[PDB]
Design a protein around this ligand. Structure first.
Ligand SMILES: [K+]
Ligand SMILES: [Mg+2]
Ligand SMILES: [Mg+2]
Ligand SMILES: [Mg+2]
Lengths: 224, 290, 51, 105, 88, 260
RNA sequence: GGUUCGUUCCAUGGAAUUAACGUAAACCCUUGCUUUAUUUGUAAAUAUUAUAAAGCAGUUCACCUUUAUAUAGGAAAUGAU
């Protein structure tokens, strides 16, 4: 028994009895702690009582002696199957960074998926395609594939314009005397040079080191 | 000569540039359009919320439990399900337990109680100190020395105390009582990481002191009196809880002091100070007779 | 504080460091202040006089 | 924190108090690690520009200065007599010499 | 093939010799000298260049000790997390 | 998300009496600015610039060759409002200090009047005409005129997109062409390599845009029309603009040192 | 777990916080230096051996290296002293 008897839930019951009477028989009990009356009407909650957890999926009806009746179940939605299909068809869509840090939690209040892929507050990513697909598939009664094609093609027409802006925006700026810094292609190559040079130092050092091992195999200390 | 002389000009031009840069920053900084700033990292300290909703708790990652493997089945009552390999704490259970603790921190402060906010983690110092300022309580952001409650006579020996009246203004004449009086103990502890410091929570249960803790999925819920199922590993969820509890104490101290101005004291002299009064009359009686 | 040590530092209030030349000629010959010639005045600024 | 700073090389050298001095003046046992981070704040606040530095930080920074002066013991130089003879003294384990060195042959 | 097991609860998760044990280099030069005498001979000329290297080794100053390895400190931080726990 | 903000003195509902009818100011700011913000919001919908100010985006995305398109909207939404804000409801008398200082840098108010107006028409393209405040570490507060193209930032921190000279009709084989060409290459090479061409004081205090003039097509193409036969047009637009300059505010934003 | 001549110091532990003795410090002799005193000691002397009261001094400064960034260590006739 490595545990200890924690009586944190009975601090009131214990303190209420110790303050009811006085140790010195024949005198009135002294004033109780200042906290005894503050939580007089705020009892603790019931702890350590395993309930039947919420079932997020229909439990196996064929099981006659089911186990894990007090185990929280996995939360699975209809979108999980769509996210896996999309991101697998567009693996490099994961390279596009996406922030999962919420600002105030009120993001699903301005999302009306009957308008289109572009919504307020969230970026155009594989989720917008999934939420748009789920809407058409349910409301418009489209099949998984039909809704997928429609919502998928709207995603491309919006991404194409994004890549065209970067090219034209730069070309347009130089036509009026606008210069920029080092592009990502150049910066990436310079970093490889600094690393390749460090590898060259490691190669020449080990190569020379192996020569000693090859010469140390045979013995020539006599100097014939 | 001309090289080091340049620094003399720059070092001397910083005041001018700073003033001019500060003025210019007030002219064209906000001209384009209005930004709908709806989240600032240091917002739970500059102006914490009075009450936390489900959106605030979710945005603060107050529902991220620990890995399913590392769980305490005792606290399977606050878990909503399983996702990303972790247990998801119910957003409704976290709010109902948080609103209850706020009612506890408020009343204890309304009855002149001594609260203690304990958060001992690398970045939990600004949070606990800010909560204490609002609730006029004590803070603790380092390892709790074992025995500071059960062995307070020794540990808190030379620490000074003071006697205050209804309106928190000090009273004169208790000089002899502040030398024999034994050290104080918190009337309520608010731990932001109960899993770490169980020596503190045990002294509270051993000394009959109520406690409030943030019970993560792997924490034993039987260590405190009032649990707050939430993610204690997140620095953003702890600042929100502390702010709520901090505001609760503030709102409690306001009522207590506002009632004192009307001659309505919400508390009576503690037993320790009460005994000193009786002895005072006994010694004073001798002066009357003799 | 009882067990804390002491850092070795010069005490310029000591009568030995105050006047490094103990000869009354140099001390009283208007070294820094003027018209402090009277030996009594110099002693009053160093010892607590009861009279 | 928004006030400008000064490069490290341009900050006047200051003799900050040591861990022992704080323990003695405060009558506490402050952890070396906790004090190491408190001292960094002193060095950071000291980087503020003097003209822009407020009066509050100045007073707070004056309590951390170490006013310790080591004892000075300067040896006296060996003089040379009017005739040009210097007297050097040397000892070895029982004895003491006195050499009068002059220009000669 | 199975994967590495989860170690049982130990008193301390550490390595006996944190920093490698340095071998005296001159001991290797002596072995080469003893090899010449075995094959060439003692009062020979083939061991001249090898005997000189042995004299130069003992004359040279030994290296300085390396800074101790801090592996055992980090092992103690993740013990309860990596293993089943701490036992005592 | 970035949202539109009301104008200075209710120009949206009423508009300037003798400069821009309410219908023109409606299409110039309430409709166009809304269009730019709708595009800007979609670009910074999930980036760090989701809560940053237009000016903060202008300086942050000035040199980035991959965020040039984000700079245009951010720089356009800023310069557009910077122009309408300075417009006054009624004519304002030029301040004594400002009037006296302008004569020292341009000789007379009429000289600066025809310069900015002339520079606008001489550009034959959308952009902005600025009245900049040049103050070097030791030199007095000297004013000058700078003409930016479609979306150019007069701030020193955004020197990467100043866009002063057109690279189509300013770089050729003539003596002036070669000179301009060398500068175009000297800037690009230096900017790319990171070298600083002209030193600048910290905090971007060298240049402080005081006044602006939006010469884009949408601003005046409706009120003053094309301008065939000299009646109206871009020229009249610039001229009429000279009668609604809030010289009081222009003087305040100048922050001229006391030299009188 | 590190470090130290050292339960020294730092960090840390789901228990520590502290007191006394030994230890350490300090003490006596000795070493360099400053001031004091000059007989019965010192050739002379403008004070330098000796005598002996008090005070200062070290691993201090410089150089090199340095873990968890918290505590430091090394080099020993060709840095100072
Ligand atoms: K002597
Ligand atoms: Mg946790
Ligand atoms: Mg200990
Ligand atoms: Mg001893």
């Amino acid at each position: 028994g490595k545990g200890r008897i924690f009586q944190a839930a009975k601090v009131y019951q214990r303190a209420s009895e110790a303050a009811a009477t006085n140790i010195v028989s024949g005198l009135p009990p002294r004033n109780p702690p200042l906290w005894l009356k503050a939580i007089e009407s705020i009892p603790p909650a019931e702890i350590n009582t395993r309930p039947y957890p919420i079932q997020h999926s229909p439990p196996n009806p064929r099981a006659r002696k089911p186990r894990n009746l007090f185990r929280p179940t996995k939360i699975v939605y209809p979108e999980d199957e769509l996210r896996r299909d999309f991101y697998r068809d567009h693996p490099w869509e994961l390279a596009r960074p996406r922030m999962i840090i919420e600002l105030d939690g009120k993001d699903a209040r301005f999302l009306d998926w009957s308008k289109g892929l572009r919504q307020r507050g969230i970026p155009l990513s594989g989720e917008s395609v999934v939420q748009r697909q789920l809407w058409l598939m349910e409301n418009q009664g489209m099949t998984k594939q039909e809704a997928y094609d429609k919502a998928r093609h709207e995603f491309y027409k919006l991404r194409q314009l994004e890549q065209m802006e970067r090219r034209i925006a730069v070309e347009e700026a130089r036509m009026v005397g606008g210069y920029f810094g080092k592009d990502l292609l150049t910066v990436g190559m310079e970093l490889e040079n600094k690393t390749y040079e460090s590898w060259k130092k490691w190669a020449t050092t080990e190569i020379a080191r192996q020569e000693s091992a090859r010469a140390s195999m045979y013995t020539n200390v006599v100097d014939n | 000569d001309e090289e080091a002389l340049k620094l003399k000009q720059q070092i001397e031009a910083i005041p001018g540039n700073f003033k001019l840069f500060k003025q210019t920053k007030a002219q064209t900084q906000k001209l384009g359009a209005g930004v709908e700033v709806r989240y600032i990292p240091e917002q739970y300290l500059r102006n914490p919320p009075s009450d936390a909703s489900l959106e605030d708790l979710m945005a603060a990652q107050a529902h991220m439990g620990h890995n399913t493997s590392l769980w305490n089945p005792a606290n399977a009552r606050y878990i909503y399900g399983v996702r990303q390999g972790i247990h998801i704490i119910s957003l409704e259970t976290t709010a109902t337990h948080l609103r209850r603790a706020a009612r506890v921190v408020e009343e204890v402060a309304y009855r002149g109680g001594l609260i203690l906010f304990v958060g001992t983690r690398p970045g939990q110092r600004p949070i606990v100190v800010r909560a204490a300022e609002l609730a006029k309580a004590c803070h603790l952001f380092t390892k709790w020395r074992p025995g500071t409650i059960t062995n307070r006579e020794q540990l808190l020996g030379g620490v000074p105390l003071t006697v205050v009246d209804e309106l928190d203004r000090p009273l004169s004449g208790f000089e002899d009582h502040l030398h024999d009086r034994r050290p104080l103990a918190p009337d309520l502890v608010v731990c932001l990481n109960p899993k770490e410091n169980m020596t503190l929570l045990y002294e509270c249960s051993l000394a009959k002191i109520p406690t409030i803790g943030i019970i993560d999925t792997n924490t034993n819920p039987s260590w405190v009196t009032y649990q707050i199922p939430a993610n204690d590993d997140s620095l953003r969820a702890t600042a929100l809880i502390s702010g709520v509890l901090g505001r609760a104490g503030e709102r409690g101290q306001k009522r207590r002091l506002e009632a004192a101005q009307r001659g309505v004291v919400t508390w009576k002299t503690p037993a320790d100070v009460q005994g000193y009064f009786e002895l005072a009359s006994a010694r004073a009686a001798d002066a009357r007779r003799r | 504080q009882e067990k804390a040590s002491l850092i070795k530092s010069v005490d310029w209030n000591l009568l030995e460091n105050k006047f490094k030349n103990l000869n009354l000629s140099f001390i009283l010959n208007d070294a820094s202040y003027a018209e402090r010639n009277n030996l009594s005045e110099l002693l009053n600024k160093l010892y607590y006089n009861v009279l | 924190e928004d006030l400008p700073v000064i490069p490290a090389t341009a900050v006047e050298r200051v003799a900050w108090k040591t861990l022992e001095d704080i323990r003695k003046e405060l009558g506490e046992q402050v952890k070396a690690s906790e004090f190491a981070r408190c001292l960094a704040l002193v060095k950071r606040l000291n980087s503020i520009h003097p003209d822009l530095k407020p009066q509050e930080i100045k007073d707070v920074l004056d309590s951390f200065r170490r006013n310790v002066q080591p004892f000075t013991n300067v040896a006296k130089p060996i003089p040379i007599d009017q005739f040009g003879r210097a007297c050097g003294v040397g000892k070895r384990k029982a004895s003491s010499a006195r050499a009068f060195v002059v220009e000669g042959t | 093939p199975n994967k590495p097991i989860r170690l049982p609860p130990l008193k301390q998760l550490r390595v006996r010799q944190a920093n490698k044990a340095e071998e005296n280099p001159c001991i290797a030069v002596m072995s080469s000298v003893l090899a010449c005498w075995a094959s060439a001979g003692y009062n020979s000329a083939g061991c001249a260049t090898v005997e000189n290297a042995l004299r130069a080794c003992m004359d040279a100053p030994k290296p300085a000790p390396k800074p101790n390895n801090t592996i055992n400190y980090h092992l103690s931080r993740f013990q309860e997390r990596l293993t089943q726990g701490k036992s005592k | 998300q970035h949202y539109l903000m009301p104008l200075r003195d209710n120009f949206e509902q009423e508009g300037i009496r003798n400069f821009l009818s309410p219908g023109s100011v409606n299409m110039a700011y309430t409709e166009y600015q809304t269009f730019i913000l709708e595009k800007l919001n979609a670009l910074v919908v999930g980036t760090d610039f989701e809560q940053k100010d237009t000016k903060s985006i202008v300086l942050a995305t000035a040199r980035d060759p991959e965020l040039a398109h984000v700079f245009n909207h951010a720089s356009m939404a800023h310069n557009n409002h910077f122009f309408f804000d300075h417009l006054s409801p009624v004519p304002v008398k030029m301040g004594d200090k400002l009037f006296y200082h302008i004569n020292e840098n341009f000789g007379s108010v009429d000289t600066l009047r025809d310069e900015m107006i002339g520079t606008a028409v001489s550009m034959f393209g959308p952009g902005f005409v600025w009245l900049v405040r040049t103050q070097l570490p030791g030199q007095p507060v000297a004013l000058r005129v700078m003409a930016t193209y479609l979306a150019g930032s007069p701030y020193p921190g955004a020197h990467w997109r100043r866009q002063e000279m057109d690279a189509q009709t300013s770089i050729g084989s003539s003596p002036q062409g070669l000179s301009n060409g060398q500068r175009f290459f000297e800037r690009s090479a230096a900017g790319f390599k990171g070298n600083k061409l002209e030193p600048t004081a910290p905090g971007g205090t060298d240049l402080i845009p005081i006044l602006c003039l939006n010469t884009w097509e949408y601003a005046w193409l409706r009120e003053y029309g094309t301008g065939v036969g000299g009646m109206g047009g871009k020229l009249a637009y610039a001229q009429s603009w000279w009668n609604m300059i809030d010289w009081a505010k222009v003087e305040e934003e100048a922050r001229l040192e006391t030299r009188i």
